[PDB]
Symmetry: C3
């Protein structure tokens, strides 16, 4: 059956004064991340392996050497038998002030390479229009599970799942206050199942309460099997974040 075009978001932080990350992210790494979220989008859509057949021309603007939360969004925009066109936007917002500094657009042509006994007959589903989704104040972000983050049993270290949750807590906090934030504490976190190597994590993070200088952020962590689509809630965490100038008023 036909499928609606979902938006997939992948978020990376460049900290103030990190010239290496800055220089690579507004550079080749920036490119790599655009392709990664393209890849994820495609795979979620067709539930089959994909490669990047081609990448359309891209214009880059380098912002000022400040710090940024950088969001990569992907949407499938056209779909053949095996060619998927994916549109990717790269938006950088200052950590301090939340000013949009870049807005690069790329177009990726993914191609499905199906495996299995019935692969001679794989097609992509009819693409239909993405529904305008009633906005959340909640950050929803994905990332792939990398071999370095997994043990030899193929399982993501929970510490590495925790760190992703914290990343999401940093994003939501910082977006809320318009300032740099720092982790002050994290509550008990229980894991319902272990996360596997062939999966994406999805973190959802939003501000629960606001003190004078701190917030409390809830994060929910899901895993999703790329090829099958199987999702499970994995963990819920609560982090306390403090706004900084030295602590500041939120």
């Amino acid at each position: 059956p036909a499928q609606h075009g979902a938006t997939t978001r992948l978020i990376d932080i460049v900290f103030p004064g990190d010239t290496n990350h800055h220089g690579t992210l507004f550079g080749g790494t920036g490119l790599a991340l655009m392709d990664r979220v393209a890849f994820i989008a495609a795979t979620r859509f067709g539930r089959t392996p994909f490669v990047t057949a081609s990448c359309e021309r891209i214009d880059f603007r380098q912002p000022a050497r400040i710090g940024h939360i950088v969001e990569f969004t992907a949407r499938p925009v056209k779909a053949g038998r095996r060619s998927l066109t994916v549109e990717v936007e790269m938006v950088a917002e200052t950590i301090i002030g939340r000013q949009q500094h870049t807005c690069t657009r790329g177009i990726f042509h993914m191609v499905a390479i199906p495996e299995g006994e019935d692969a001679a007959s794989y097609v992509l589903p009819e693409l239909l229009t993405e529904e305008t989704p009633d906005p959340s104040d909640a950050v929803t972000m994905v990332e792939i599970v990398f071999p370095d983050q997994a043990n030899s049993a193929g399982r993501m270290f929970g510490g590495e799942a925790i760190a992703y949750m914290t990343k999401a807590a940093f994003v939501a906090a910082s977006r809320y206050c318009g300032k740099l934030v720092v982790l002050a504490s994290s509550e008990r976190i229980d894991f319902a199942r272990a996360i596997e190597i062939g999966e994406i994590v999805e973190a959802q993070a939003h501000v629960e309460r606001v003190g004078r200088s701190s917030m409390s952020i809830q994060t929910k962590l899901w895993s999703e099997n790329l090829l099958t689509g199987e999702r499970h809630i994995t963990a819920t965490g609560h982090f306390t974040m403090v706004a900084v100038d030295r602590p500041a008023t939120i």
Copy 2:
């Protein structure tokens, strides 16, 4: 019939955050710091019960961010309680300044590992009994071998093993003089066996001799199979490190 009881050993994992590295600083005193706390817990657990472990849960943790200078950060883990399958591991994260060796932070975390045994005699697996260690009176760090450090034959690149020895050399030298140090030369290093992906490396580094500005450090590298416990000495190296302000009096 009955696994013999085991003394709770302390496992140490050490990471350097260099002066002015705002990205590492911001992640380490943050989510990455979490992830490392988990990793050293995971090693400790695995050494104890010689079986696969997962993280079932993580108790609340409080964090304090030190000044943006440079730090040697040590993550120690002890098992503190042991059921049939539950292992409680206590982790301490301590950051000392590279310049001056002043303790700036001291966060404690409690990790609840659970064994997931594999094999025919899986259903019958019990954890050993835990005795307390005897608190004893030269640096000793472990780290896991990551896929990115290994070739397609599953063997760690010797270069990567050398780097780890150098990291240990830096830790010892720097602790000794209380200043930042740099590598000046390394001596012939011969490798007795190749290190494999499912193993941890263990470095032991201490100061051999002290010049006016310089210092010699011997490092010994071991590998240890996480599940079996098989250890072998792998390499011995000698690095010269120089104290720096530009060269300084050690």
Copy 3:
């Protein structure tokens, strides 16, 4: 096995101005690791078989000033037994601004072949012949697990990023200044690159504006054990010289 000429393999890494972590590791343990990695590549290309590092001769290091550097790691085989390969590695650091050579560390690596297969116990390394000295940047890197998907294929994004790195190297060497990416053209991929392979980038300056340069990059894959190469992609990147834009 017929005799083989000793090729030079080059691996390049950039340390940006002000990156004290990379600086502190690269002029240190990481530098070491890279010298070994390129040695390993050279060996594997020569003998087309698995290799380990049996030993590493003494190395002297000099720390340059905390500025930024393009760092080049070159490896040549220099002696070849039945199973022992001696590889010579040079680590040269040039300033990004000004292109001054600041370091020049030499290392000697003893690789040993560990052949696999049916006629394994009978494997000898092919004979070593000296290459003629050759008359544009070529660089190789291994494809790491983290750059590949669960099907064993390098992400095309990761391929692109390598090409961009090569573009940066060529541009920056050309103008003697720091450069930044301004745009990339359409890039088409001929085949997917696999985990057990190296990528090889060739990059050179095509045309020069006042502040811009356009760089062509060609990407190849090579199977380490078989030697099978294929052209993978060709890209065109525009780079801009910087002080804020500057005169090339």
